[PDB]
Amino acid sequence: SFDKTTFRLLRGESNLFYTLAKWENNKLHVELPENIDKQSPTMTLIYDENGQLLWAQRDVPWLMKMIQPDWLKSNGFHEIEADVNDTSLLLSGDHSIQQQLQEVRQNNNNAQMTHSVAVNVYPATSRMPKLTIVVVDTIPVELKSS
Question: Which stretches of this protein does UniProt put in the Periplasmic compartment?
Answer without folding.
Answer: 1-146
